[PDB]
Symmetry: D2
Subunit: 370 residues, 4 copies
């Protein structure tokens, strides 16, 4: 809600000034030169001054070609009473990031909790599985999830079986199955795929040196502080819920199920962080309300581990998620992040990613089949 709101008001002022359908190249190219200036000198840039929480530009964002591409198809400037909206600027920034990938991509990462199964149940989309299939032939595919199953690959495969079903038919002969990765526990458990389209655990020895270290005792007392507070949350609000503890995660689960108020869940999240602050713990963790789980580790550092493990340059990486569902350390600080809000947008970006170096193909981020 920083860079998007930045352009939204700019377009709102061009709208009410009655010039947004005319030649706004002078305004667009000044913003683009701002973005190019920020890409070269990201510290003490002019964009940094206006938007202090702005990330790092790993690419040169062609925001002028992104607006012209979106406006030629959807004619948002021909609307007399409806200015450009939050979602249209978001589509334009997704359009600019895809257009900036002239070199191509070697690693494409997904947020499964938001992109592959936002419903909360196993993968289920053949067309989406087909896009991931053909993209796996050209690049590495990694999937990041907050599921807490420790290191048993059968539980993670249960959620992605419909996706691994498609790998069985087309992704075994050419050896592309070797490049598919799964990071469980946000950033603590890694899995790969074999010839039989089955997930197997990658031992820590093969990738532990790519993850920043956190003390075992530090991990535990994070869960200890989280445990006592949830116990008080149960007694304070008379909840019919139970605490489920794992090696690096602890959760507030309702008994089979019972409904916990969304506000009480948010209240519990604010008691946890505030308590961890009072004990002067500096280790990164992720207290998450799903409509509660406290994982030691976040999905952003999990994207970092995968970039080091595969030895990929920041330019050739792109992450796909839905920032509506979390409001968190932004994953945009570690990779190029597309923001998709429904499956039709996800299949639109994946189709344009399949045609990156092709000039005849126009980038689309909203309608897969239009």
């Amino acid at each position: 809600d920083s860079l998007i709101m930045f352009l939204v008001e700019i377009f709102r002022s061009l709208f009410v000034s009655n010039c947004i359908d005319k030649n706004i190249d002078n305004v667009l190219l000044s913003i683009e030169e701002m973005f190019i200036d920020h890409y070269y000198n990201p510290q003490h840039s002019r964009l940094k001054y206006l938007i202090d929480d702005v990330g790092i530009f790993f690419t040169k964002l062609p925001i002028t070609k992104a607006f012209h591409t979106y406006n030629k198809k959807y004619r948002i400037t021909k609307r007399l009473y409806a200015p450009p909206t939050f979602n249209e600027v978001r589509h334009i920034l997704n359009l600019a990031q895809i257009l900036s990938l002239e070199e191509g991509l070697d690693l494409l990462t997904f947020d499964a909790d938001e992109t592959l199964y936002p419903d909360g149940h196993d993968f289920n989309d053949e067309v989406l599985a087909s896009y991931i299939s053909c993209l796996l032939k050209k690049m590495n595919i990694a999937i990041v999830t907050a599921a807490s199953y420790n290191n048993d690959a059968e539980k993670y495969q249960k959620r992605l079986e419909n996706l691994l079903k498609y790998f069985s038919k087309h992704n075994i002969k050419d050896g592309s199955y070797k490049n598919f990765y799964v990071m469980g526990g946000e950033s603590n458990y890694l899995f790969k795929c074999n010839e039989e389209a089955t997930l197997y655990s990658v031992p820590e020895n093969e990738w532990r040196h790519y993850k920043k270290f956190v003390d075992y005792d530090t991990v535990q007392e994070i869960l200890n502080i989280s445990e006592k507070c949830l116990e008080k949350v149960i007694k304070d609000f008379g909840l019919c819920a139970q605490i489920q503890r794992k090696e690096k995660s602890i959760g507030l689960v309702p008994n089979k199920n019972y409904m916990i108020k969304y506000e009480v869940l948010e209240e519990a999240v604010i008691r946890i962080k505030k308590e961890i602050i009072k004990n002067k713990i500096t280790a990164p963790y992720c207290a998450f309300n799903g409509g509660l789980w406290v994982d030691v580790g976040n999905k952003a550092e999990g994207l970092l581990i995968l970039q080091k493990l595969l030895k990929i340059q920041k330019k050739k990486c792109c992450h796909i998620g839905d920032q509506f569902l979390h409001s968190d350390f932004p994953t945009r600080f570690c990779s190029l992040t597309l923001w998709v809000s429904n499956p039709q947008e996800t299949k639109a970006c994946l189709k344009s990613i399949m045609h990156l170096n092709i000039k005849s193909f126009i980038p689309e981020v909203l309608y897969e089949n239009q």
Copy 2:
């Protein structure tokens, strides 16, 4: 009559909260001015509880604050035009009953203990619950008519526990269904949408005379239907209830659709939409084509509504209508669900303190359906809330039952 209800049939959310293609699931994360204009009475109470919370007194004795609010509510019930509440909030509505807002808060606070929170103040959704509680607690003498907004709270129908509650309440009061769907006077198509509800009526509502209390208002306020002993819908002739409705000349109805048709044809050209226009007897719509369905941008559909409203003002038309979106298509109806409610209580000769409407104000504008003007309204956002409110209505007068507006089994 609809002349007394402030309709704004022809009168911006940069975040597009009402866009359900992007707002796909339970909404909770995201909105101040948007929630305020949907109901200024809720946000009026949200700001008062927030100050009591930040003054560190919301879990102590706040009866002094609640009772002065309740007295303002009682006074607004007695003189709704010159009351203090009418001055602080201008678009409140009419309190057809005295609202016991204090006991409604104690009831919600005793079960959910929202004042025990240290960091989350009472939210907009919780005050809406407390309001629904006050509306139900005010029904001390019962209900004679219960209206449902089918498009917002019922839809086809597929909920056996919901059908059972309606059947149980059908034995005690008139049940009316108001839908924006228009299938002319053919009750077959309306029967297909309410089939599982009518099939339940066949089993439990035929022997007693309860099936005679079921009404269906199609076309928002244009096509009325009743239920026979075979649990089958049949048209109530227009001549039977036409005098309960503000008369709109047939020449005015067609001209409204003619204005809407030419605006929509221009919207098709301006944006290259793969859509066509299907025209009904009293309604007209912009419908996306089927891909050899297509998609029209949510912002283009919102642009088309405003153009249609602005062109109707240019043509000096004061007839009530409802130009609205609906996610995927555009629809202009020469009809109004608020007048549809007024027709029903005039036909049934119901006094206003014995009527209750159930709808989801998130999915409609306050210009089309103004808040608290036809009857007392319940704002529900999910079926579990609907089931909880119906069971609470089912257990009126039953002192053993504590009214619940959020959780059915809890």
Copy 3:
């Protein structure tokens, strides 16, 4: 004219109009810089509408380059609103914008202000509300290629106690050689001499410079907002213009006038008893006021109590169903309800002199009055000046209507 004599503006917890607390020019601009967006937007919606446009151009880092395409598009809307004030696109975006009696060259006004003060060279301070108040004042002055026949001043806001500025008495004098009108809420019946005492040093200047060429006849004074008219004679002395002479240009209000005074008096008597005020009520033929008593100086009435009393009187006016035009103001230390309207007093002066509205200009400070009482740009072109330095700058530009118009600094 969309008058809201009994309506009220949104409440201001910051009390910007409280002159006792906001008594420094340094205090005002700091609070203007922060706690002020809602009040400034209500004082003039077209200025704040332009502030947000430049703020977006500034933040996009293009305000230093060629922004003519934005400025000329804004100017086209001002021309279309001048040609169709009822259903202009500008009317849709700004409901309370008002009437443009002239074609405003807003592009040429921005250039003129920017080339002298270089507000565009700033990197951290975008254009402010007061600078887009200045560019618009310049746009209205540049719009008078066909000049002015009448120039009106709000003496309560722009000239004064009594008139005391000979340099300001120099500008009006040579301007008097066009019609000059003085509008004042001060009510002294048809007593021509009591109005003289407050314009004493202005009229004494007229005696030395405006008698020979006969310019003294074109000077007018509207007293009681719109109740008592005065002219100037050969001896620089005000004399009463009989009400019979001009009353047909004014909306007739039934001698209804007395009932407004009875309503306000009874409300102010309750106000005194409610807050234990050491004040009395003074009643004139067409006005009534709450004045504090003398200290056995004079006592002090709270600004908020004066605010409460104003709202009460206007609500009591509504419940009595009186729709006659009037003005109840706060006045800082004393309250006054007058059966008259300065905006109506301007229309009388325009009708009395039969002058086109394109040839009329008004000088006043909108910080000191409400828009429901004097609507924006509905009687004539209006210049919003904040201190005598801006008044002399604007008057000097009107004099030389080689000269580059200046509205901010008299010398510079």
Copy 4:
């Protein structure tokens, strides 16, 4: 108190729109006073600190409930049906609670001269109160005007106040308790038997001040001088750069018979200065101030000077009270001593009259 005043403004607004503020609101007020008392005991872990981050520290227990009753009984703002409490009335109530918390009196009373004493000093009734208060406490005046060691230049501004001391505060030796701190926190002065200012040697009080070396003080002025030099050329100013040893200023030139700089340019230049210093990794407390017509960046701050006079005169923080105007410097002294926010001379004399009667007199902070 900008954050604390709006805290109560918003709470009294809800009591207004709930129709209960004229009724008995003792439960709401004493719930607030309990939060204030808990903050006085544990300021770092208080509920109030979570609500207001910049609340600071309360050196006294605030009787905000008694302050509300006192203000409302005389002015009856709860009888207003349409004008809820304003920012100023809560500010008046916050001044009442602080004066009411001084049960044991004051040993030091401090004045910001630029904000509350300069309408040169010309007010006899104000000079009469200061003379009376000097007979029972230490009176300190803090000024941003820096004339270095030269006491004759400072005395010009306080002449009519010092000449009032000459006729009343000399026989009892009250002049020995009058102090002047020029340069914000750099030049201390005292008064002698002739009602005349004399400078105090810095060696005698420098140990009460955090030390900044000639190397650091000068670099503040070097960066400011070059940023101000760019500003004069950027906007074509007819102004000069006046450099002193501990301050440097942008001063407009006089007219041929002074010129005026746009307030936005003076604000544009302060921001350029501050952001350039941060680029140079300087963390020393300086004060870049706008002041309407001329810019001044002084090495030092008025708050540091209040701490200097506290340690020098051996004054407990409960016995200190500062009088200033925070409308003029909202770009805080509340962290060093009890601070009253006054906006006009009548408020100053009202608050001062209440301080003379700290030990039947109902406190007043509005009209004397």
